[PDB]
Design a protein around this nucleic acid. Structure first.
Lengths: 79, 206, 151, 157, 100
RNA sequence: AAGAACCUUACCUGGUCUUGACAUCCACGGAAGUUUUCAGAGAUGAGAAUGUGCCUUCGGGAACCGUGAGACAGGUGCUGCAUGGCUGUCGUCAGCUCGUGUUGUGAAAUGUUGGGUUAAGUCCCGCAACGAGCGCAACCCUUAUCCUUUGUUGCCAGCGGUCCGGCCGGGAACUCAAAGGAGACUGCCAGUGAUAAACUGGAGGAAGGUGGGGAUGACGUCAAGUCAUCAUGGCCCUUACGACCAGGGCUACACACGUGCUACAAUGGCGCAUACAAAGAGAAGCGACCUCGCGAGAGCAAGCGGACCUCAUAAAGUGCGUCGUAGUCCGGAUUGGAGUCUGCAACUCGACUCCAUGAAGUCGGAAUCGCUAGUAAUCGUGGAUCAGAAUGCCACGGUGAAUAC
RNA sequence: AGGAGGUAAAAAUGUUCAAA
RNA sequence: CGCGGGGUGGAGCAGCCUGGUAGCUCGUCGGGCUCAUAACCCGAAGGUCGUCGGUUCAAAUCCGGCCCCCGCAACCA
């Protein structure tokens, strides 16, 4: 809903993602950048996103792209 | 819980502010902060100087500091040299030309802060409080105070259940705005704990 | 209320024809303070009445008014806990005051359309005194004589 | 009356370290009740994070028949809750035989599953527990096999 | 309010001046409609390269004296309770109990 | 809590620190500092460079940085029933005491009671009481009328030019501005009353009886509240309950309540035109104009640290038109899509705009609250806080009642 | 001043010890 | 063993006899009054009709077996 001045991400994550892509589908990334928006190249990756006490792995399916990683890691458990 | 701080309500109408300087919001808070600094610092330095009140002023870039107090001797120091000592350190506290200047207060018995220091220091010396209280009242009263009211709050006498006790002689019209009052506070630091002291003095009606 | 004496505040007469009584009538119908609009209703509604009956503004008004004026009313006397309604003559001020009040009240209902019209029709019914407002008056008179055993 | 601490340690992290990564939303399967045995094999789920669906299991292989990319390895490092099918040659208070050995056993037994008469006169009690030292598993099992009426007493997948 | 916190405050300011305000150009002119190229990108990226603090947004404006992070009347730079303590004392110039 | 995305933050999770994030002390070394890279969530770890400076203990530097050790350091850790400081409160209720004398053996009473009277132990009279004090009022601030002084960035009546804008001469009258003042005192009169206090009515008057508002809150009650503003006795931890970092949580949601905003419409919504405010805020801030944009806004960007310029053309209102009592042009929730700004960051978790959607609700059970005058009700404006973030709070003016037997 | 007349339905309860 | 009755919200009882639609009272839940509980007031949820099977379009209800409980009878022996 914002920042239409280049979709926002993270140097450490981005570089880690590029490093992964050019290195092939390696081990799941363990980033804490729930702020990070998804980028095209990410598709196929199984980046883990910490969400309080885990990293809850998420396959980067096609659909998601403009979505920020947090939306894929529910934080408040219920029932 | 009730009573308005006397000195506050009696500002504009009777008693002039401890500070007297103008400033836009730009360098305002800073000036006030430094004031606080010279206040507590200079207080500590003259903890033994029987200091009364320390007025701070800023006549354009300048930062004058009048110090009402008893015993100008120990204040200024020999040859007045100790003053310039406080000068140096103070200007270094406000990064500016501190023009210190002193006017000895004539009678300590009448001034509130001076009384409070007497009382507190004495509780610090383990003297029974009641004796000191009645003492201050006798002294200040006979000396000429139109009226007086002192209070001691806290543990007092090492009692395990804190309480408050007080005294007052003659007219002490706190609601009478025009009426002058010299309210001030100080507090003891007995091994039992903090024991506060308040002290009112009706010196004159107008 | 307690000891305090009242200061029967003055009310400015209506601008179109200085009827201070109608002036206060507007003040009753007035809501949220938008007096201008209140006055707008009272007027157009008053004209429509004058137009209707053939009687002029206000004269038709008091004629429509008196026919709803309570003369008596209940009151709650008690004796240590024995509460019971008591009839008692109404003050002339409080009289027509309550008259206008109830009138505005029956006017609150009867959803024709604009207040002007709904009110116009209410006063028109008062002209032959068979509207809802008079229903209140009668009811209060029943509350009187069907209880007129106290004085 | 005695019926999450064993999985509060997984909720306290450790255990699974898929491709060397720690603290993942892992969670043990069911059709297969993996314990540190034939190791295990992970599987990413949409929600629920990683599913530790044990190494070599049909439903896991089904997922191996769908999206292999989701499939991932699995380890252990430094095991709780299992279910052992222990069919009895009919009971009639012979559950007591089962009920007996429980004392020195130190695993909590959650749900005492059972069934019997549906066909051939013979009961089929099954038991949830909470395994600890994998050795302790082997230490217990024989005692179960020991009881004469107990023809069946091995871990059920 | 926790010497640590007061300390944290100071450090936040320190960096806010050692970087931003003099390196905020990235956040500034380089995040404007002109250098549409990857330049702009790298800019809003070198941004995170900087220390998390330094950004004035994290400055909590605590009471000059006590450290209390609330009721901080910017004007005086003091926490309400304390701004009052000085007030009634007359330590503040021309500041009296309003009344009308 | 005057304002939780990070921060704040005290809580959780994991990664980390230990004389520490911060202070005084001493030994040694190194100016400080500044530039860029690699790993890492960052903390920090490894650095790669670079720079070496104002007095000379002239074998120095004062410094600031790093390391070492021991004192300590540090706590938003418990105790508000150990405290100060501070505040709510019964309650702006009119009460609460004491000195002395006197009565009673004494706890105590008397005073302060009683007749009147007041908003008031206010005042008068009497009274074994005489006095005094904290209070009550007065003094204070604001507003209400007029006078005097001053005339810009305010004002325009009088004359002039008027490109009709007080725009320019120029005017000091006026609104106003902000100081210095006048005025109200039961002072005047009538009557009631003990020739008492006072009270009832009238006069003049801007103002009539404490004019209206506010500030000011007695002795004390609650062993009220706060150890988390702060300060402090204790006690407690001190390779940790202390310290740093990332993400997280304080915003969870079967449910209950309190406090408010927006409605249920026609004394109305909506479209067009048009009228009259006050009070404020403002510079790493208010930001016209002008331009593109449906707008939120974006670009450029004067003036402005201020009776100047900006926020910022007020809305209710009035004029005209339409809708015509429908869940309906009521209601705006909720939801999708597309966007803006702040900010490292908008997913959790921001405010706002557009298009789309368009629910509950058709004046609310038992019960309950506020309010006596320019008040209630209704209407919009601004400020603190704050990068952004209110229907809350604080303050401002507009419209303007009903009733008090 | 002497006096008689009328004049107020129901409405339970509160754990123990504890401030110079 | 025999004859009859009954089994219905957490409890006590209607409705069954004449099939479609199970009601009252207290209790329970939420709100209110009160300093606070009770009482009192406002609103609300609840019962596979003992169990099994049958007849019927439909079974709380008509029919049967079974489980339970109460009543009566159990004599000349």
């Amino acid at each position: 809903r914002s920042l239409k001045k280049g979709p926002f991400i993270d140097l450490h994550l981005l570089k880690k993602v590029e490093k992964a892509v050019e290195s092939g589908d390696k081990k799941p990334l363990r980033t804490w950048s729930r702020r990070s928006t998804i980028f095209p190249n990410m598709i196929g990756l199984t980046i883990a996103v910490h969400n309080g006490r885990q990293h809850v792995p998420v396959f980067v399916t096609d659909e998601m792209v403009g979505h920020k990683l947090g939306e894929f890691a529910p934080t408040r458990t219920y029932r | 819980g009730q009573k308005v701080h006397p000195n506050g309500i009696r500002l504009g109408i009777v008693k002039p502010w401890n500070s007297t300087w103008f400033a836009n919001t730009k360098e305002f808070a800073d000036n006030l902060d430094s004031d606080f600094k010279v206040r507590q610092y200079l207080t500590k330095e003259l903890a033994k100087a029987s200091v009364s009140r320390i007025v701070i002023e800023r006549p354009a870039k300048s930062i004058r500091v009048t110090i009402h107090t008893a015993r100008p001797g120990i204040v200024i120091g020999k040859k007045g040299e100790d003053v310039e000592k406080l000068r140096k350190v103070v200007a270094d506290i406000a990064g500016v030309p501190a023009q210190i200047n002193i006017a000895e207060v004539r009678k300590p018995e009448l001034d509130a802060k001076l009384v409070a220091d007497s009382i507190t220091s004495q509780l610090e010396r383990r003297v029974m409080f009641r004796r000191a209280m009645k003492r201050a009242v006798q002294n200040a009263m006979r000396l000429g105070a139109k009226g007086i009211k002192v209070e001691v709050s806290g543990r007092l006498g090492g009692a395990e259940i804190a309480r408050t006790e007080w005294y007052r002689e003659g007219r002490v019209p706190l609601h009478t705005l025009r009426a002058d009052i010299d309210y001030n506070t100080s507090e003891a630091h007995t091994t039992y704990g903090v024991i506060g002291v308040k002290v009112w003095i009706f010196k004159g009606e107008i | 209320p307690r000891r305090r004496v009242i200061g029967q505040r003055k009310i400015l007469p209506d601008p179109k024809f200085g009827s201070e009584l109608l002036a206060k009538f507007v003040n009753i119908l007035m809501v949220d303070g938008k007096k201008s609009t209140a006055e707008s209703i009272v007027y157009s509604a008053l004209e429509t009445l004058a137009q209707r009956s053939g009687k002029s503004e206000l004269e038709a008004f008091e004629v429509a008014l008196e026919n709803v004026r309570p003369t008596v009313e209940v009151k709650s006397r008690r004796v240590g806990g024995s509460t019971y309604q008591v009839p008692v003559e109404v003050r002339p001020v409080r009289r027509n005051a309550l008259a206008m009040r109830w009138i505005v009240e029956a006017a609150r209902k009867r959803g024709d359309k604009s207040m002007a019209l709904r009110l116009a029709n209410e006063l028109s019914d008062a002209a032959e005194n068979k509207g809802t407002a008079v229903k209140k008056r009668e009811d209060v008179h029943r509350m009187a004589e069907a209880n007129k055993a106290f004085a | 009356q005695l019926q999450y601490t064993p999985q509060n340690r997984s909720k306290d992290n450790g255990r699974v370290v898929v491709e060397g990564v720690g603290n993942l939303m892992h969670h043990i399967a069911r059709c297969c009740q993996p314990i540190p045995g034939d190791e295990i094999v992970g599987f990413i789920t949409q929600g629920r994070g990683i599913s530790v669906h044990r190494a070599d299991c049909e439903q896991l292989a089904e997922l191996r028949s769908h999206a292999p990319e989701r499939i991932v390895d699995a380890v252990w490092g430094e095991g709780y809750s299992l279910v052992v099918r222990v069919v009895a040659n009919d009971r009639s208070g012979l559950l007591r035989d089962i009920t007996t050995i429980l004392a020195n056993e130190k695993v909590n037994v959650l749900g005492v599953a059972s069934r019997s008469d549906t066909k051939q006169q013979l009961a089929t009690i099954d038991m949830t527990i909470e395994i600890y030292n994998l050795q302790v598993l082997g230490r217990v099992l024989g005692k179960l096999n020991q009881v004469p009426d107990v023809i069946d007493a091995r871990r059920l997948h | 309010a926790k010497q640590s916190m007061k300390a944290r405050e100071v450090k936040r300011v320190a960096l806010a001046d050692k970087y931003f305000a003099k390196r905020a150009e990235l956040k500034a002119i380089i995040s404007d409609v002109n250098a549409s190229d990857e330049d702009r990108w790298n800019a809003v990226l070198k941004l995170q390269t900087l220390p998390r603090d330094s950004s004035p947004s994290r400055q909590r404006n605590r009471c000059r004296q006590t450290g209390r992070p609330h009721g901080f009347l910017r004007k005086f730079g003091l926490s309400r309770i304390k701004v009052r303590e000085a007030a009634m004392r007359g330590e503040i110039p021309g500041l009296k109990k309003a009344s009308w």
